[PDB]
Structure formats: structure tokens, C-alpha cells
Amino acid sequence: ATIGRISTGSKSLDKLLGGGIETQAITEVFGEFGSGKTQLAHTLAVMVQLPPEEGGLNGSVMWIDTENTFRPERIREIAQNRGLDPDEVLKHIAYARAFNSNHQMLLVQQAEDMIKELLNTDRPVKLLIVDSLTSHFRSEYIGRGALAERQQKLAKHLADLHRLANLYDIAVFVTNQVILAHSATLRVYLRKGKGGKRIARLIDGEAVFSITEKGIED
Numbered sequence: 001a002t003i004g005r006i007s008t009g010s011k012s013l014d015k016l017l018g019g020g021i022e023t024q025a026i027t028e029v030f031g032e033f034g035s036g037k038t039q040l041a042h043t044l045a046v047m048v049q050l051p052p053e054e055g056g057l058n059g060s061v062m063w064i065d066t067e068n069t070f071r072p073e074r075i076r077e078i079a080q081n082r083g084l085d086p087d088e089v090l091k092h093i094a095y096a097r098a099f100n101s102n103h104q105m106l107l108v109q110q111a112e113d114m115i116k117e118l119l120n121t122d123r124p125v126k127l128l129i130v131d132s133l134t135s136h137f138r139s140e141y142i143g144r145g146a147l148a149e150r151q152q153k154l155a156k157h158l159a160d161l162h163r164l165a166n167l168y169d170i171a172v173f174v175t176n177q178v179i180l181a182h183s184a185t186l187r188v189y190l191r192k193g194k195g196g197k198r199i200a201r202l203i204d205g206e207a208v209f210s211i212t213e214k215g216i217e218d
Contacts, residue, residue, distance in 0.1 A: 007055025028184035043215030059126025
């Protein structure tokens with residue numbers, strides 16, 4: 001099946017990404033606290049719901065939150081300022097809080113049930129967000145021997161996410177607060193710049209954007 005692309009809201013970032021974040025891929029954004037990772041996640045959760053000629057995929061969203069950082073009113077605000085009904089946009093986000101890393105892993109397997117349900121409807125799941133991908137793994141697997149164990153568990157979790165992305169034509173978008181190996185298909189380093197701007201660079205030019213009432217934009 002052909003790849004879909006979800007606009008981020010920023011023409012600059014979209015160009016860096018070749019048009020937007022891809023389905024059948026895991027895109028990891030990483031950066032320090034406050035770099036804008038969760039703002040980008042909120043924006044994508046609205047953009048994906050737009051029709052294709054506006055940069056979306058007419059899609060639904062599943063969101064796995066590990067830090068209690070999802071904000072329904074931020075969704076509603078971004079939606080309204082982009083001409084969308086805030087409550088309809090929020091309705092199409094299936095939200096779950098992951099209590100620990102083992103629950104996080106089960107929630108990904110659980111997500112396949114809803115993905116299958118919606119697959120041949122007019123708003124199939126097109127975006128799966130895990131924010132934060134790594135926070136529970138970092139707190140639980142620590143100390144001598146933890147590097148190998150944590151990386152194996154993460155690799156299995158990312159394998160499950162790759163399978164959902166590839167089997168069901170979904171964009172998986174994950175955040176990571178930052179010598180370790182990584183398994184995402186594309187890694188984007190995000191940082192704060194001057195003038196309140198955020199700067200994005202692909203890892204292994206740079207896009208510049210602002211956080212606004214529309215989510216992000218140039």
C-alpha cells in the first residue's frame with residue numbers, strides 16, 4: 001500500500017520530512033525537556049484528521065500517554081483555530097494512560113483491536129502516538145545490567161509498533177526526552193532556538209517553526 005503523509009502544520013518541517021510524517025514508519029522526535037515534542041504530537045493529532053488535500057489522511061488517532069501530558073483543551077484549541085469542530089476532533093482521539101512499561105507494551109497490543117475495528121470505516125486509525133516512548137523504561141530498567149535488558153524490551157516494543165504501522169498503514173509518532181542504539185525509521189532532533197522558535201534536524205538542513213494557537217506553524 002502507498003505511503004501517506006501527515007502535514008505537521010509547518011511548511012518548513014514538512015519540507016525537512018519530505019512532505020510530512022509517513023505512514024508505515026515510526027518517527028521519533030527527541031530533545032530536551034521543553035523542546036516542543038508534545039506540542040508536535042498534539043498538532044499531528046489534529047492534522048491527521050484533515051482531508052488529504054489539506055495535509056491529513058481523514059484519520060483517527062490513538063494516543064498512549066506515559067507522563068499525563070495530553071491536554072484535551074489544547075486539541076480543541078488547535079482544531080478550532082484550523083477550522084475544525086473541537087469536539088469532533090477530540091472524539092476521534094482514543095486516549096490511554098500507560099501506568100508502567102509493561103502496561104505500555106500491552107496497550108500497543110491492545111491498540112490493534114481498535115485499529116481492526118476502524119480499518120474499513122471512513123476514519124481508520126492513521127496516527128498512533130506514544131509520548132513518552134522511553135520514560136517508563138528509563139525509570140524501571142536502571143543499574144548494572146539494565147542497558148542490555150532495557151534495549152531488548154524497547155526493541156520488542158518498537159517491533160510491535162513497526163508491525164502496526166506496516167500492517168495497517170499507520171504513522172507511529174513517538175517522543176523521547178534526551179550511545180544507545182535506536183530502531184525508529186526516522187529520528188528528528190528538536191531543540192529550542194531564538195525568538196521562541198523550535199529547530200528540527202534529521203539525524204542519521206534544519207526546519208524552524210513556532211508554537212502557536214494553531215499548534216505549530218512557520
